[PDB]
C-alpha cells in the first residue's frame, strides 16, 4: 500500500515540473520508489503478505512489482531519444501515460479480488493504445491498436461473465477464500466452458500459437517506452492470472490442458523457427518473446511445483532480456532510421561496447547457465519430462532454434563487414550504455541468490 | 561486359594448370605437365573455324570439371583462401575520424590538420567533378561502369574520394 500512493504522487510530479526538469524529476522518483518496492520481496513463509483488506502480496507477486517499479526508469531514459523535439505538454502527457501505467500494474499484482484484479488487468489497456498509436512511428500503428485491444477484450470479456458467475455460486472470489474454500470441478459440459472462459482471457495476453497476431503487430510499431513495458510486464499480466485462477479449475485442468499446452508446445518450436527467417530486427524479439512466453504456458498447465517455479523464473528473466533487446533495437534503429535487419551490419567495429551489450543480451536470451533464463527453462523441462518423456524432444528442439536466432542477430548486425554508405552512426551516448547496464546488471547479480525469483512454491 | 572467345580460353588455361599444380605438387612433375598443357593448348592454334573453336572449348571445360582437384588449391588472399577478408575486423572507414573527441584529435594534431586539408580538396572539387561528369555522360546515363578520367588540369578524376581514401589492406 505504501508503494501506490507515491506512484500516484508522481502524477503531479511530472505534470507540474519545470520545462527541462520533467524528466530529471520523474527519473529520480521512479528510482527512489524502487526502494519501497524492493521491500516487497521481503516476505514471510508460506503465508502470503496481506497488509490490507484490498491489497496483498506473496512470493509470486513480489518479483513482478519490483520489476515494474524498476522498469519505469528504463522507459524514461529510453524515451529520451525521440521525445526531445515534441512540445512540453505532449512530453508531460507521455510521462502521464507511463506513470498511469505503473499505477495499474502496481495494483493488479496486489489485488486480492478476482474482479478487482480483472478491472485493473484490462484497465492497463487504456494507457497502452495511447502510447502505441499517438506516439508510434510507422503507418500501421493505427492497425496496431485495433489488433491489440480487440484481441484482448474478445477473451477478457467472457472472463468477466465467468467471474460474476463464480461470485453468485460460491459467494466470493478473494484469492485466499477460493484457495481455502476450494471445490473440485466436475466434468459437466457447463464446467468445460467455464474453464475455457477462465483460461482464454489470460491466453490471449500470453501469445499462443494462433492467438499471437498482435505480438508482431504491436511490439514492432510501438514506441520504445511502450515496447519494453508491453513485452516485459504486460505479457506477464496473464502469467499472474493463470497462476492464481488455476486454484479453482481442478481437476478439469489436467484433462482440458491437452488442446492448449500442446498448441504452445508445437507453436513454440514454430515461433522460434520464425525468428530464423526474419527481415525486421524488432520482429525477432517479438517472435522470440512468443516462443519464450509460450514455454511457461506448458509449465502452468502441468500445475507441477517445479513447473511453477520455472515459470516464474523465466517470467521475470524473459521480461528483463526482452526489454533489453528492444533497447538495442532502438539504438540501431535510431542511428540508421530503419528496422531492416540486413541494413546495418558490422556495427561492432564502430561501437565495441554496444556489441558487448548485444553479446550479453543475445547470450542471456540463449539461456546459458547459470542465468535466470536457464534455471527457469530447466525447471520447466524437468517438470515436463515427469509429465511425459517425449516432452524433451520438442521443448529441447526449441533450444536448438533458440541458440540459432539469438546468435543470428548478433552475427549479421555486429559481426561481419560494415556497410560503407551508412555515414550516420556516432559514438554511443552514456544514456543507452547506462540503459543497457541497468538492464544487464540486475539480471546477472540476481543469479547468485535467485530465491526471490522462483516463487511461492519455492 | 563480355567474356569473348579470347579471354575464355585465357581464363580456362589459368584454372587448368593451377589445378595441375594442385595435382602434381612437386615442381618437376608440375613443369612437365604444364608444358604439355601448354603444348596441347596451341597444337590447334590455327583453328580459324569458330564453330570448331567453340567445340574445342567443350572438351576443355567438362573434363576440367572432372579433372579439377576435389580439394582445389587457393592462395590465402584470393577467393576461397584461408585469409580472405581476414582483416576486415580492423578496417574502419575513414569517416569515423571526425567523430573523435577534442582530446582524441588533439592526440594526433598533425594528421587531423592534414585530414582537414584532405577534406578541403573533396569539398571544392566535388562540384567540378560532378559537372565534368554530367557534360561527358552519354544520354540515358553511362553505358559502362568505367569512370572517365580527369579531362583538364586541376580537377581530380571524377568520383575519387572513396577509391583514394580506401582503408589500407593491412590496417591494424
Amino acid at each position: 500500500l505504501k508503494i501506490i500512493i507515491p506512484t500516484t504522487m508522481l502524477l503531479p510530479m511530472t505534470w507540474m515540473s519545470k520545462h527541462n526538469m520533467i524528466w530529471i524529476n520523474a527519473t529520480v522518483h521512479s528510482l527512489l520508489i524502487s526502494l519501497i518496492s524492493l521491500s516487497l520481496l521481503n516476505q514471510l513463509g508460506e503465508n502470503s503478505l496481506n497488509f490490507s483488506l484490498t491489497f496483498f502480496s506473496d512470493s509470486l507477486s513480489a518479483p513482478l512489482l519490483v520489476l515494474t517499479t524498476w522498469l519505469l526508469p528504463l522507459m524514461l531514459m529510453a524515451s529520451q531519444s525521440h521525445l526531445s523535439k515534441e512540445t512540453t505538454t505532449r512530453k508531460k502527457l507521455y510521462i502521464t501515460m507511463l506513470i498511469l501505467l505503473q499505477l495499474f500494474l502496481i495494483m493488479t499484482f496486489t489485488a486480492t479480488e478476482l474482479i478487482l484484479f480483472y478491472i485493473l488487468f484490462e484497465a492497463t489497456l487504456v494507457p497502452t493504445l495511447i502510447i502505441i498509436t499517438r506516439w508510434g512511428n510507422q503507418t500501421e500503428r493505427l492497425n496496431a491498436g485495433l489488433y491489440f485491444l480487440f484481441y484482448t477484450l474478445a477473451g477478457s470479456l467472457p472472463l468477466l461473465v465467468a467471474l460474476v458467475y463464480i461470485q453468485n455460486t460460491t459467494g466470493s472470489l478473494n484469492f485466499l477464500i477460493i484457495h481455502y474454500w476450494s471445490h473440485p470441478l466436475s466434468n459437466s459440459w457447463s464446467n468445460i466452458f467455464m474453464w475455457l472462459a477462465c483460461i482464454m482471457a489470460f491466453m490471449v495476453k500470453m501469445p499462443l500459437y494462433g492467438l499471437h497476431l498482435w505480438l508482431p503487430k504491436a511490439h514492432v510499431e510501438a514506441p520504445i517506452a511502450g515496447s519494453m513495458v508491453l513485452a516485459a510486464v504486460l505479457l506477464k499480466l496473464g502469467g499472474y492470472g493463470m497462476m492464481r485462477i488455476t486454484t479453482i479449475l481442478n481437476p478439469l485442468t489436467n484433462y482440458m490442458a491437452y488442446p492448449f499446452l500442446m498448441l504452445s508446445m508445437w507453436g513454440m518450436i514454430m515461433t522460434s523457427s520464425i525468428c530464423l527467417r526474419q527481415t525486421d530486427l524488432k520482429s525477432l524479439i517479438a517472435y522470440s518473446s512468443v516462443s519464450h512466453m509460450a514455454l511457461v504456458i506448458v509449465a502452468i498447465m502441468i500445475q507441477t511445483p517445479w513447473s511453477f517455479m520455472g515459470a516464474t523464473a523465466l517470467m521475470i528473466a524473459h521480461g528483463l532480456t526482452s526489454s533489453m533487446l528492444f533497447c538495442l533495437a532502438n539504438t540501431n534503429y535510431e542511428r540508421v532510421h530503419s528496422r531492416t535487419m540486413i541494413l546495418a551490419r558490422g556495427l561492432q567495429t564502430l561501437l565495441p561496447l554496444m556489441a558487448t551489450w548485444w553479446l550479453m543480451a543475445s547470450l542471456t536470451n540463449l539461456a546459458l547457465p547459470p542465468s535466470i533464463n536457464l534455471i527457469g527453462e530447466l525447471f520447466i523441462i524437468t517438470a515436463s519430462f515427469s509429465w511425459s518423456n517425449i516432452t524433451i524432444i520438442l521443448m529441447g528442439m526449441n533450444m536448438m532454434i533458440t541458440a540459432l536466432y539469438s546468435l543470428y542477430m548478433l552475427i549479421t548486425t555486429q559481426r561481419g563487414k560494415y556497410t560503407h554508405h551508412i555515414n550516420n552512426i556516432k559514438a554511443s551516448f552514456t544514456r543507452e550504455n547506462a540503459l543497457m547496464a541497468l538492464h544487464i546488471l540486475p539480471l546477472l547479480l540476481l543469479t547468485l541468490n535467485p530465491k526471490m525469483i522462483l516463487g511461492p512454491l519455492y | 561486359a563480355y567474356l569473348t572467345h579470347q579471354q575464355k580460353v585465357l581464363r580456362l588455361y589459368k584454372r587448368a594448370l593451377r589445378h595441375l599444380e594442385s595435382w602434381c605438387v612437386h615442381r618437376d612433375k608440375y613443369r612437365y605437365f604444364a608444358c604439355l598443357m601448354r603444348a596441347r593448348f596451341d597444337e590447334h592454334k590455327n583453328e580459324k573455324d569458330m564453330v570448331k573453336a567453340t567445340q574445342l572449348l567443350r572438351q576443355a571445360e567438362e573434363e576440367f570439371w572432372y579433372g579439377q582437384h576435389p580439394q582445389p588449391y587457393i592462395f590465402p588472399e584470393s577467393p576461397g583462401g584461408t585469409s580472405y577478408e581476414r582483416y576486415e575486423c580492423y578496417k574502419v572507414p575513414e569517416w569515423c575520424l571526425d567523430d573523435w573527441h577534442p582530446s582524441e584529435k588533439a592526440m594526433y594534431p598533425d594528421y587531423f590538420a592534414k585530414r582537414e586539408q584532405w577534406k578541403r580538396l573533396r569539398r571544392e572539387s566535388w562540384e567540378r567533378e560532378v559537372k565534368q561528369l554530367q557534360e561527358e555522360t552519354p544520354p540515358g546515363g553511362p553505358r559502362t561502369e568505367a569512370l572517365p578520367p580527369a579531362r583538364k588540369e586541376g580537377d581530380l578524376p571524377p568520383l575519387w574520394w572513396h577509391i583514394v581514401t580506401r582503408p589500407r589492406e593491412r590496417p591494424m
Binding site: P352, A427 | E94, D99, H101, S103, Y108
Partner: peptide, 12 residues
C-alpha cells in the same frame, strides 16, 4: 616506420 591506425572513438 609506423603508420597511424584508425579506430572508433573509445573516449566516450
Amino acid at each position: 616506420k609506423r603508420l597511424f591506425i584508425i579506430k572508433p572513438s573509445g573516449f566516450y
